[PDB]
Symmetry: D2
Amino acid sequence: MSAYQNEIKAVAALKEKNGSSWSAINPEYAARMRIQNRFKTGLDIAKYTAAIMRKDMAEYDADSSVYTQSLGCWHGFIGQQKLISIKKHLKTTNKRYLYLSGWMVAALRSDFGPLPDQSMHEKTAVSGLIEELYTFLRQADARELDLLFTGLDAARAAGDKAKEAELLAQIDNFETHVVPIIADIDAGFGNAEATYLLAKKMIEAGACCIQIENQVSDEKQCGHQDGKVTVPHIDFLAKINAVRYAFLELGVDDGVIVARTDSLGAGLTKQIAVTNEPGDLGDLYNSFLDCEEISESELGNGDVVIKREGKLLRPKRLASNLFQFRKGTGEDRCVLDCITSLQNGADLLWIETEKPHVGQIKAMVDRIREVIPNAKLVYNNSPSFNWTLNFRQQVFDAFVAEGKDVSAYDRNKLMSVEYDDTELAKVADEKIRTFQRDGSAHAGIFHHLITLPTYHTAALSTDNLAKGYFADEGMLAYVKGVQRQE
Amino acid sequence: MSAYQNEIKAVAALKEKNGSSWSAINPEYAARMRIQNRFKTGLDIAKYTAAIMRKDMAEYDADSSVYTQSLGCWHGFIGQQKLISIKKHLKTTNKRYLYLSGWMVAALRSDFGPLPDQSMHEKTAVSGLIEELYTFLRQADARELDLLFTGLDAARAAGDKAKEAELLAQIDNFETHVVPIIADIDAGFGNAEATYLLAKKMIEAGACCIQIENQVSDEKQCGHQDGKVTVPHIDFLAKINAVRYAFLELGVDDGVIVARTDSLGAGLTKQIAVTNEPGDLGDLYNSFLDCEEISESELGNGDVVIKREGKLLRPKRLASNLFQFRKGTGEDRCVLDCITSLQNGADLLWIETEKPHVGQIKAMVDRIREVIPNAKLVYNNSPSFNWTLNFRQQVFDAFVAEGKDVSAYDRNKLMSVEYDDTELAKVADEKIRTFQRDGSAHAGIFHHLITLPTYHTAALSTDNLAKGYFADEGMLAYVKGVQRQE
Amino acid sequence: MSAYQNEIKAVAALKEKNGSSWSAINPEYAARMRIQNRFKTGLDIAKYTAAIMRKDMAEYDADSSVYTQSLGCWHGFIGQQKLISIKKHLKTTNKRYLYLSGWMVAALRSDFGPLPDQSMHEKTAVSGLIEELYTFLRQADARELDLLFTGLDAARAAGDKAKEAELLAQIDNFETHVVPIIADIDAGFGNAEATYLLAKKMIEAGACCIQIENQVSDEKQCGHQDGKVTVPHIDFLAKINAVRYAFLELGVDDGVIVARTDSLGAGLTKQIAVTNEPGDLGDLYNSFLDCEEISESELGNGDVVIKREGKLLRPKRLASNLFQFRKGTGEDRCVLDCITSLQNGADLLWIETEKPHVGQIKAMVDRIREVIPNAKLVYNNSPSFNWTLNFRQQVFDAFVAEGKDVSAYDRNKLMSVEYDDTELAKVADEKIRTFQRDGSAHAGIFHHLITLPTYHTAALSTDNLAKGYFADEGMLAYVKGVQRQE
Amino acid sequence: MSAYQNEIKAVAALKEKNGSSWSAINPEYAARMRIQNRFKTGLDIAKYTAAIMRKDMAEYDADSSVYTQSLGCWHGFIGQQKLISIKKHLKTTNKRYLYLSGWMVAALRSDFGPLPDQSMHEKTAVSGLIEELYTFLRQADARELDLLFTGLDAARAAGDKAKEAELLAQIDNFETHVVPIIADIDAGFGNAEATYLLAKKMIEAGACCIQIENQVSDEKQCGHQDGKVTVPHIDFLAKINAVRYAFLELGVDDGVIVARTDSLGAGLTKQIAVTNEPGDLGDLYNSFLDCEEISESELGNGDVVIKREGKLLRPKRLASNLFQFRKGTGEDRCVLDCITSLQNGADLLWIETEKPHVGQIKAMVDRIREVIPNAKLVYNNSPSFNWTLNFRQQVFDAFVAEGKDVSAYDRNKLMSVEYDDTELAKVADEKIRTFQRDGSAHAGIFHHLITLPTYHTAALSTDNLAKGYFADEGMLAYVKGVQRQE
Ligand SMILES: [Ca+2]
Ligand SMILES: [Ca+2]
Ligand SMILES: [Ca+2]
Ligand SMILES: [Ca+2]
């Protein structure tokens, strides 16, 4: 028997048990409400979506062409219209997820108004947006099912048996708009206990996947090129553990943790790591510090020094009480971070990079996979990269191997108003088009997202309408720009 | 002295008064924060914007070409990007307002998820959105002023006196993003006391203008063409009075009330109005009831009858306990509604119509203005009208006067895939382009809005990106669709 | 195996399945978190508590001495301390519920500040308080279980096997603080669809029982003694049905609906009920109208008249457009209301009375039970009754039967500073003490509550401390008044 | 002219200006609404209350008997009933403030449910409670004024001119329930920018006084007796500056900053302070570190050492990466903290102590006042001190000076069931009663508060009712315990 039939039977039995006092209750109508509300709680969503993500991860492991994608959405309505569009044009939700952007929560969803991306807003805005996204996806299910039940009644009123049968099949095979979300928790908005508390609220809202990072965003030195600040592994691993316990408490056994490393762009640290024996994680972290040998006499009062390899050394230290890593150690620290995360409870990796470059990320993933062979990445196709410059430049240098042409193209004015229609341009655009496929084939990327794309699409579409409506076009700007497209 | 200078002086004096304990306080830095926060409370916004709207109403009275416009915005970020676009392209905020759409609050901003437009959501979502819109507009001011103060410091560091002087002038003449809002309160979300309470919260959030309606939206009969339900004038006038007292309590002497009538599409009423003498408002309302003379013997048990003009008559009554107005009385009731509103405390009118038709609205406004000569309308350029059909049809019939052509155009397939490039089409589009101007010149329209335009622009722009990104275009859909435009 | 053991086994198996990457996860620690979070969602609470209430209703049906009690609580902390006190002193939660007072939500929990009890506040404050109450009860469970697991670890560290065994038994037999709540939804905060929407949110928050009323609180005439306003049964029954569908959609098959009638104190109605044949519910409702025969000539213009029993009659009508019921029909209308509710989907009754009087309520319940023999009441032991006056007066008149004494007691100054120690006083206090038992034995009362008792206890306890602390007692007022008691 | 008269005149003039369309507006009624809403925004409250606190601080400086008091309140209703009680019994609000307890926000007001006092909850709960407290105080004003205007109308209806005149005087001299609040911001819930953002929201809600602390509450080692963790002065001073800029931006020139030091119970620090020359604040902070001289050969790999007074020393360091201060340096660090705070922008001090002991606090204040002679304290009369033990013990040892008795009293069983009626007990209670007066006379205490007293009073009063109501007393527990007192 179908889910719909089973629910009609179930409500009819309650009606019978309760007798004539329930005479006004219509069992088929109640059944439709039940079918229209498949996911009654956020934890039901979290368990359902966790299983989907685990299946997708296994299918990617078997075939690197079968990867997953998402766009960051800053409101339930934006997520809803994205999933409606996916179903309309692409016919299945399979391999499409939501992304919860901490940047967009800070920029758009705080009671404080727009804030920078430093975990300064009220942390309930994060869990609030997850719940909102799933409320809107569940309502999209309910509306489409209601339309199907309306057509079912119309088929019945016309005695059309074939159409009734096709609609009942569409109802039984209905594809929910509810999909997995990768939810950004920043660094947990506090210590490990605070991380657990927030993760728990995010999972109760429906999240099957939590992304957590090893940086201290509120200590960035904007005046330094690599001004981000990392914590020792023990601090970050404790937060991974806190997120795991939130999943476990709630019964989401399959919950997914994405460990993000910011080490590539982080030249600083607040702490010197505790170390108990040489070669352990504390010692490895401290090994990257930029030190100098200063005689005990040449040392300033209050200077801080560390014993490394039998000598007392002075790590370079800013006025802000931050210590510096040696230049050029970003990649090495990322690889250590990532291996350590997968060895200690993370499920997926995120390496924050400064440009979209398949070879660069492949190099790091190859080093990681010589230790953890199926290590999988979530990759931010960042909206703050200038994709055209990066890729025309990338295709320029790919020429220089046997690129005859080279001299015909400057390399400094490549991004231009008009280098269009050139081979470098059509090829650059093709490399952009295949970037995700190529990174998933060669650099272990399981999931491709853009963090804040719908910030820009909402701004642009508002500007494009306002620009006409308030000026000579008046209502024609709306009719042409909006009404004619839909 | 400029506002900026005055604030530097003011903070320097406090620093001096407090002595060396305030040595770390930088008076110019504090002054910039004060300049960046011109509107410290919502009531400061409400008073500032009320004066703007009153000025605009006076300028429209003197010159019908000088009208005002707004688009409905469903989030602070959408309102913010609209005002940023206005300033970028059109160089002034003058004559541009915000509109708070009750439909979009119901559809998008409730803790219940999407709801129909029946005042069923939590009413604090309405005031919450007003505050959010003004938080985002105030932040846009702060960000642009911060950029100007940054350029001021750079001019000073370069010893560039002319540029320093130009920037100080740009700071002193800065045009705020804060503009008036026309805020939809539906029918007040309750009785007159409840209306006052909500209005007060909306005005405290910054609203200088409240739009209130005479319908009972939660009693619509969707099964009737003119299924809306009105209340007797005494009920509606009490709510106008409640809104006035909220403005007065808060000191917003100049607050604006828009009285919306739904009578054109309302064929029903729940109440029979109390009347004390013939010809008063109660009697006029009841005069429009659709009655029939039934002998006391021919009357059903429990039937309800009214004495009109010396006879007992039975008003037509639905099973839902609603009474029917005579067909064709919509316009007459609208004119009575509107005259009554302006005679009893409203400032502006809104006549809800079923199509964008200048002659139709002019006819009603002419009747109103023979009593109230400067009566002014707020006109919803409704997004649910098919603008192309309506206006090609309107231009078809404008031909038929001496429109030779007529026979060359069907009138039933006018809206078409390809009647484009015809004279009827180019002319229809021109009529759309000039619709607002023409209605403001001929039909007393002070303000033109669209209620839910940014619902559609957000949906469309999300669909247009998703359609490519998740299919073969991948990142090229974002680079082309988004990054290349901005 | 115990729940605790089963959860340790379950987490150990996941740890084994996942391998050394989960080495830091402690299965017993995770198991404790699971035991400490028995009720992971509000719907789990609603189903658990609904079964308790159904069991209690059956046990009351078998034995009228086994009734249930609650106190209204206005904050999660108040509910929590009530349940902690119950467990400490009375050793079981059995037969004790929570009550959610709509009056206290209006007075205390609105974003508007204190409001009168007219459903004018934001309706999400109602569901919000249910969730808060259950959050605090769940946290009380977690804290007490954490203390038991701490003692378990201490027993183990001391090698005390008997104590370890007793603590494991206390953990396996732990009695949750989570109990049923009777949740006031007023009249649904809107129409039937709105009622469904709010009920659904209240049930998702944990409520197994919803109390809904047939009055229109925002139309009370405070200037009339019996100034409340009722709706026809069809309107109220539609709202009962809406609440049932919310329970059914959510899978809370056992959900309980309390139908409250306000007819005893309601002399008015806004509507004249639709009636299709004599004797139906519409006709019965209209039968109670106070009408007068006026000749068609003697009738005012616009007067409204109804055909009852072959004649045209004019129901008495206020300027407010409300119709009057005949005096002395309150009880008859209550009995009709109640029978109708139980015949059409309600589970329990609430008859709002003007004084605590067992005989008065028994009279109505006897009439109801001659139709519905097991009809059960929820009875508000109202805090706005003067219990001492009512009951000394009640005991005075119980004397007058063969009460010799009568002359020794005035009857007008009975409530007095000093009629204490009299037989009338000690007996009046005893009648108060046994009031609930007696009403449950003789008047069908399944549940006794007080609506807003913790409003008064919080006010009193704050006043009693402030009165001393800020005056000569200083810190001694706190030490004596607070610290010495606990 | 009175405020009331002036407002009647003001509204009558608007009515006249607007003409007959405002005929329904009653100017006296509107005037009453204005009088009933004296404080239209939180910033109006903050400026009004800041001036009160500054006046009180000056009056305390002139006379140490004129000090101020508050009780922590966890809900607007609790604060409201406290101020109502003050006005009823003590006839003026003068010298009584509110206290906003961060502990009670964590324990009671978070969306997460009860949390420990570690700034882990959503920070908007803090500002939310300030706004709620002032909403309830403003409503208490409105209700009492409404009662006075009702009596005014009754006097007029009786032609009683003397009573009309007395009521108008009571209206013109009405004492608002709105008083200053000392608002706990913990350590700012983040860095200095985050502190500013939250302070701004708290001041906009009405707070004229912000209390900020130098500890890192989320790093406490509960396993250490003095397990709190401090930050170097530069970090704390930056947060003082952030709070000052919030006051200044908002125009609250008179805003008060309370700098709380936790150094007395803090034996740890996460950071070693940056120092530029000997004797500066960084060097002074580091001077308190507990170091040991270890030969470069005897040092572990990765050990951290500091140069102090020409030698390399190893500060004691926990596995948690925290450094230890020398035992017995708590008082010295408190005195440095406090002097530094008043020298760098704080207005008042708070020294967190472990027992209520006038001599102990006087000792520290004397050291502070030899540098800052009018330094003033806010003193927490902590509810977690056992006041009876501490003070019977204090009075026991005050005997031992020439206390003959000594031998008659043990000193270990002093707190007892029955040492009552002894001279030590009556004297201990008298010392408790005069503790605040004595500390204000001898130890510079301007303000005495209890942090979480209404947590306990609400728990106790709920338990005391539940204990009877649910057991044999039934309704008599409410009538006796509640109804008879009020
Ligand atoms: Ca992030
Ligand atoms: Ca509306
Ligand atoms: Ca109620
Ligand atoms: Ca604190």
